[PDB]
């Protein structure tokens, strides 16, 4: 499971400030991996936080606690 190249390409091109900007094939494959690790990290850290608070499941409250540090790491 993971993100499709085309999706990632469209997501990137949405925000480029210049029309000339392009993304190499390898870079795009790498971005696919990078996005997957980002999501997985969010999820895993969310779980650890839920476990630490002894919660039944990961709620938004637990998630929000780990976001600041997650964003610093990326």
């Amino acid at each position: 499971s993971g993100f499709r190249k085309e999706l990632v390409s469209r997501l990137l091109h949405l925000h480029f400030k210049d029309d000339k900007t392009k993304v190499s094939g390898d870079a795009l494959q790498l971005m696919v991996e990078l996005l997957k690790v980002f999501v997985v990290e969010a999820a895993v850290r969310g779980v650890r936080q839920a476990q630490a608070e002894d919660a039944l499941r990961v709620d938004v409250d637990q998630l929000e606690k780990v976001l600041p540090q997650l964003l610093l790491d990326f």
């Binding site: 469209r10 400030k17 790498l30 690790v37 980002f38 969010a42 779980v47 709620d59 938004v60």
Partner: protein
């Protein structure tokens, strides 16, 4: 709508990824949490995209390469390592 379609596609993949983690960790995610990670992942693409562009043009290039991507992972040793591993594996094929 264009962005709604992109979002929904992101949301679908985030759902799958989270479900894999819920299995591996025997711990569930609320539907709201999965949605939050999805919005977050969408927002993150903006930062990744803008930074990649600036990194490219900083090296006077208009096309982003894997060095730009590695730079994106510069901030955490374990991340840079993971991303560098993946890049070699990609240069392999």
């Amino acid at each position: 709508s264009y962005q709604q379609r992109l979002k929904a596609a992101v949301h679908y993949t985030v759902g799958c990824l989270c479900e894999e983690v819920a299995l591996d960790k025997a711990m569930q995610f609320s539907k709201q949490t999965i949605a939050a990670i999805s919005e977050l992942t969408f927002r993150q693409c903006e930062n990744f995209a803008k930074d990649l562009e600036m990194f490219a043009r900083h090296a006077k290039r208009t096309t982003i390469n894997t060095e730009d991507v590695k730079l994106l992972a510069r901030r955490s040793n374990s991340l840079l390592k993971y991303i560098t591993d993946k890049s070699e594996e990609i240069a392999q094929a």
